[PDB]
PDB file of C-alpha atoms in Angstrom:
ATOM      1  CA  UNK V   1     -20.169  15.948  54.759  1.00  0.00           C
ATOM      2  CA  UNK V   2     -20.361  14.711  51.139  1.00  0.00           C
ATOM      3  CA  UNK V   3     -18.268  12.996  48.406  1.00  0.00           C
ATOM      4  CA  UNK V   4     -18.451  13.334  44.552  1.00  0.00           C
ATOM      5  CA  UNK V   5     -16.910  10.492  42.426  1.00  0.00           C
ATOM      6  CA  UNK V   6     -16.475  11.507  38.717  1.00  0.00           C
ATOM      7  CA  UNK V   7     -15.878   8.414  36.513  1.00  0.00           C
ATOM      8  CA  UNK V   8     -14.592   9.649  33.086  1.00  0.00           C
ATOM      9  CA  UNK V   9     -14.927   6.591  30.787  1.00  0.00           C
ATOM     10  CA  UNK V  10     -13.551   6.189  27.236  1.00  0.00           C
ATOM     11  CA  UNK V  11     -16.772   4.232  26.517  1.00  0.00           C
ATOM     12  CA  UNK V  12     -20.222   5.371  27.823  1.00  0.00           C
ATOM     13  CA  UNK V  13     -21.293   1.666  28.095  1.00  0.00           C
ATOM     14  CA  UNK V  14     -18.415   1.241  30.675  1.00  0.00           C
ATOM     15  CA  UNK V  15     -19.965   4.258  32.518  1.00  0.00           C
ATOM     16  CA  UNK V  16     -23.404   2.549  32.479  1.00  0.00           C
ATOM     17  CA  UNK V  17     -22.206  -0.940  33.679  1.00  0.00           C
ATOM     18  CA  UNK V  18     -20.116   0.708  36.469  1.00  0.00           C
ATOM     19  CA  UNK V  19     -23.398   2.433  37.545  1.00  0.00           C
ATOM     20  CA  UNK V  20     -24.893  -1.032  38.289  1.00  0.00           C
ATOM     21  CA  UNK V  21     -21.668  -1.858  40.208  1.00  0.00           C
ATOM     22  CA  UNK V  22     -22.117   1.266  42.447  1.00  0.00           C
ATOM     23  CA  UNK V  23     -25.811   0.392  43.109  1.00  0.00           C
ATOM     24  CA  UNK V  24     -24.847  -3.196  44.109  1.00  0.00           C
ATOM     25  CA  UNK V  25     -22.171  -1.786  46.492  1.00  0.00           C
ATOM     26  CA  UNK V  26     -24.827   0.633  47.919  1.00  0.00           C
ATOM     27  CA  UNK V  27     -28.312   1.676  46.469  1.00  0.00           C
ATOM     28  CA  UNK V  28     -28.353   4.946  48.558  1.00  0.00           C
ATOM     29  CA  UNK V  29     -25.403   6.310  46.470  1.00  0.00           C
ATOM     30  CA  UNK V  30     -26.855   8.422  43.618  1.00  0.00           C
ATOM     31  CA  UNK V  31     -25.455   7.778  40.123  1.00  0.00           C
ATOM     32  CA  UNK V  32     -25.939  10.259  37.228  1.00  0.00           C
ATOM     33  CA  UNK V  33     -24.954   9.252  33.573  1.00  0.00           C
ATOM     34  CA  UNK V  34     -23.370  11.410  30.814  1.00  0.00           C
ATOM     35  CA  UNK V  35     -26.956  11.974  29.573  1.00  0.00           C
ATOM     36  CA  UNK V  36     -28.366  13.968  32.555  1.00  0.00           C
ATOM     37  CA  UNK V  37     -25.658  16.717  32.475  1.00  0.00           C
ATOM     38  CA  UNK V  38     -28.032  19.377  33.889  1.00  0.00           C
ATOM     39  CA  UNK V  39     -29.376  17.232  36.782  1.00  0.00           C
ATOM     40  CA  UNK V  40     -25.841  16.408  38.140  1.00  0.00           C
ATOM     41  CA  UNK V  41     -25.358  19.699  40.099  1.00  0.00           C
ATOM     42  CA  UNK V  42     -28.848  19.325  41.717  1.00  0.00           C
ATOM     43  CA  UNK V  43     -27.996  15.728  42.744  1.00  0.00           C
ATOM     44  CA  UNK V  44     -24.710  17.046  44.348  1.00  0.00           C
ATOM     45  CA  UNK V  45     -26.835  19.341  46.634  1.00  0.00           C
ATOM     46  CA  UNK V  46     -29.020  16.330  47.561  1.00  0.00           C
ATOM     47  CA  UNK V  47     -26.068  13.825  47.952  1.00  0.00           C
ATOM     48  CA  UNK V  48     -24.729  15.791  50.987  1.00  0.00           C
ATOM     49  CA  UNK V  49     -28.249  15.537  52.519  1.00  0.00           C
ATOM     50  CA  UNK V  50     -28.187  11.727  51.735  1.00  0.00           C
ATOM     51  CA  UNK V  51     -24.782  11.535  53.550  1.00  0.00           C
ATOM     52  CA  UNK V  52     -23.702   9.455  50.525  1.00  0.00           C
ATOM     53  CA  UNK V  53     -21.416  10.012  47.469  1.00  0.00           C
ATOM     54  CA  UNK V  54     -22.734  10.918  44.007  1.00  0.00           C
ATOM     55  CA  UNK V  55     -21.019   8.985  41.170  1.00  0.00           C
ATOM     56  CA  UNK V  56     -21.107  11.216  38.053  1.00  0.00           C
ATOM     57  CA  UNK V  57     -20.337   9.375  34.807  1.00  0.00           C
ATOM     58  CA  UNK V  58     -18.557  11.609  32.256  1.00  0.00           C
ATOM     59  CA  UNK V  59     -17.308  10.626  28.714  1.00  0.00           C
ATOM     60  CA  UNK V  60     -13.641  10.872  27.502  1.00  0.00           C
ATOM     61  CA  UNK V  61     -13.983  14.221  25.664  1.00  0.00           C
ATOM     62  CA  UNK V  62     -16.925  15.455  27.784  1.00  0.00           C
ATOM     63  CA  UNK V  63     -14.168  16.594  30.297  1.00  0.00           C
ATOM     64  CA  UNK V  64     -15.387  20.281  30.165  1.00  0.00           C
ATOM     65  CA  UNK V  65     -18.444  19.006  32.078  1.00  0.00           C
ATOM     66  CA  UNK V  66     -16.272  16.919  34.530  1.00  0.00           C
ATOM     67  CA  UNK V  67     -14.005  19.833  35.688  1.00  0.00           C
ATOM     68  CA  UNK V  68     -16.981  22.264  36.198  1.00  0.00           C
ATOM     69  CA  UNK V  69     -18.910  19.600  38.228  1.00  0.00           C
ATOM     70  CA  UNK V  70     -15.668  18.889  40.143  1.00  0.00           C
ATOM     71  CA  UNK V  71     -15.090  22.562  41.003  1.00  0.00           C
ATOM     72  CA  UNK V  72     -18.806  22.959  41.943  1.00  0.00           C
ATOM     73  CA  UNK V  73     -18.551  19.958  44.326  1.00  0.00           C
ATOM     74  CA  UNK V  74     -15.171  21.124  45.737  1.00  0.00           C
ATOM     75  CA  UNK V  75     -16.828  24.572  46.271  1.00  0.00           C
ATOM     76  CA  UNK V  76     -19.099  22.843  48.876  1.00  0.00           C
ATOM     77  CA  UNK V  77     -15.878  21.408  50.439  1.00  0.00           C
ATOM     78  CA  UNK V  78     -16.745  17.878  49.209  1.00  0.00           C
ATOM     79  CA  UNK V  79     -14.215  15.031  48.664  1.00  0.00           C
ATOM     80  CA  UNK V  80     -13.905  15.089  44.833  1.00  0.00           C
ATOM     81  CA  UNK V  81     -12.614  11.825  43.293  1.00  0.00           C
ATOM     82  CA  UNK V  82     -11.907  11.552  39.483  1.00  0.00           C
ATOM     83  CA  UNK V  83     -11.573   7.992  37.930  1.00  0.00           C
ATOM     84  CA  UNK V  84     -10.289   8.056  34.300  1.00  0.00           C
ATOM     85  CA  UNK V  85     -10.975   4.785  32.397  1.00  0.00           C
ATOM     86  CA  UNK V  86      -8.588   4.724  29.391  1.00  0.00           C
ATOM     87  CA  UNK V  87      -6.258   1.990  27.981  1.00  0.00           C
ATOM     88  CA  UNK V  88      -4.119   4.918  26.649  1.00  0.00           C
ATOM     89  CA  UNK V  89      -1.582   6.073  29.330  1.00  0.00           C
ATOM     90  CA  UNK V  90      -1.509   9.687  27.940  1.00  0.00           C
ATOM     91  CA  UNK V  91      -5.340  10.002  28.266  1.00  0.00           C
ATOM     92  CA  UNK V  92      -4.860   8.736  31.845  1.00  0.00           C
ATOM     93  CA  UNK V  93      -1.881  11.036  32.691  1.00  0.00           C
ATOM     94  CA  UNK V  94      -3.085  14.386  31.171  1.00  0.00           C
ATOM     95  CA  UNK V  95      -6.475  14.164  32.906  1.00  0.00           C
ATOM     96  CA  UNK V  96      -4.787  12.787  36.068  1.00  0.00           C
ATOM     97  CA  UNK V  97      -2.456  15.766  36.607  1.00  0.00           C
ATOM     98  CA  UNK V  98      -5.028  18.364  35.337  1.00  0.00           C
ATOM     99  CA  UNK V  99      -7.727  17.411  37.927  1.00  0.00           C
ATOM    100  CA  UNK V 100      -5.124  16.471  40.677  1.00  0.00           C
ATOM    101  CA  UNK V 101      -3.615  20.031  40.761  1.00  0.00           C
ATOM    102  CA  UNK V 102      -7.193  21.394  41.272  1.00  0.00           C
ATOM    103  CA  UNK V 103      -7.296  19.480  44.632  1.00  0.00           C
ATOM    104  CA  UNK V 104      -9.132  16.317  43.393  1.00  0.00           C
ATOM    105  CA  UNK V 105      -8.057  12.713  44.275  1.00  0.00           C
ATOM    106  CA  UNK V 106      -7.622  11.194  40.752  1.00  0.00           C
ATOM    107  CA  UNK V 107      -7.329   7.436  39.962  1.00  0.00           C
ATOM    108  CA  UNK V 108      -6.207   6.013  36.575  1.00  0.00           C
ATOM    109  CA  UNK V 109      -7.668   2.748  35.123  1.00  0.00           C
ATOM    110  CA  UNK V 110      -6.817   0.563  32.076  1.00  0.00           C
ATOM    111  CA  UNK V 111     -10.373  -0.794  31.625  1.00  0.00           C
ATOM    112  CA  UNK V 112     -13.524  -1.894  33.595  1.00  0.00           C
ATOM    113  CA  UNK V 113     -11.514  -4.106  36.047  1.00  0.00           C
ATOM    114  CA  UNK V 114      -9.202  -1.296  37.320  1.00  0.00           C
ATOM    115  CA  UNK V 115     -12.113   1.185  37.048  1.00  0.00           C
ATOM    116  CA  UNK V 116     -14.259  -1.127  39.232  1.00  0.00           C
ATOM    117  CA  UNK V 117     -11.571  -1.475  41.963  1.00  0.00           C
ATOM    118  CA  UNK V 118     -10.964   2.336  42.143  1.00  0.00           C
ATOM    119  CA  UNK V 119     -14.745   2.965  41.994  1.00  0.00           C
ATOM    120  CA  UNK V 120     -15.493   0.716  44.981  1.00  0.00           C
ATOM    121  CA  UNK V 121     -12.340   2.075  46.762  1.00  0.00           C
ATOM    122  CA  UNK V 122     -13.811   5.615  46.373  1.00  0.00           C
ATOM    123  CA  UNK V 123     -17.148   4.172  47.724  1.00  0.00           C
ATOM    124  CA  UNK V 124     -15.288   2.671  50.770  1.00  0.00           C
ATOM    125  CA  UNK V 125     -13.591   6.089  51.412  1.00  0.00           C
ATOM    126  CA  UNK V 126     -17.049   7.798  51.358  1.00  0.00           C
ATOM    127  CA  UNK V 127     -18.417   5.250  53.913  1.00  0.00           C
ATOM    128  CA  UNK V 128     -20.444   2.963  51.586  1.00  0.00           C
ATOM    129  CA  UNK V 129     -19.449  -0.713  52.344  1.00  0.00           C
ATOM    130  CA  UNK V 130     -20.828  -4.064  51.026  1.00  0.00           C
ATOM    131  CA  UNK V 131     -18.317  -5.961  48.886  1.00  0.00           C
ATOM    132  CA  UNK V 132     -15.318  -6.370  51.237  1.00  0.00           C
ATOM    133  CA  UNK V 133     -12.187  -5.683  49.117  1.00  0.00           C
ATOM    134  CA  UNK V 134     -10.677  -9.185  49.773  1.00  0.00           C
ATOM    135  CA  UNK V 135      -7.940 -11.292  48.108  1.00  0.00           C
ATOM    136  CA  UNK V 136      -9.778 -13.871  45.927  1.00  0.00           C
TER     137      UNK V 136
END
């Protein structure tokens, strides 16, 4: 029992504002930025014990980190989600297929809006519920 949501953002500030969005959807979900690269794998061990997802923010180019975290999480039999935030459809597609063939459920996003929907959708699929995904 455990889920690992890897949000690969073209801008690290998108990664940071989406962190706040996860915490508002559920504070018990642990979020780790692009900064604390070392501490991610420790937080994955703990996230299973929390019965909550861990949302790992990775940068567009810092993908070497993303795939190794993904494979480490998937090694524990965890539901690995990968959300790529890029306005460029090639940056979306190449990462999409690369992580998808490794057994990970990968979402593509244009910007913060699409990133936010897929983020909270991955939070709903892990069990964390707050903001009901309703038609405004």
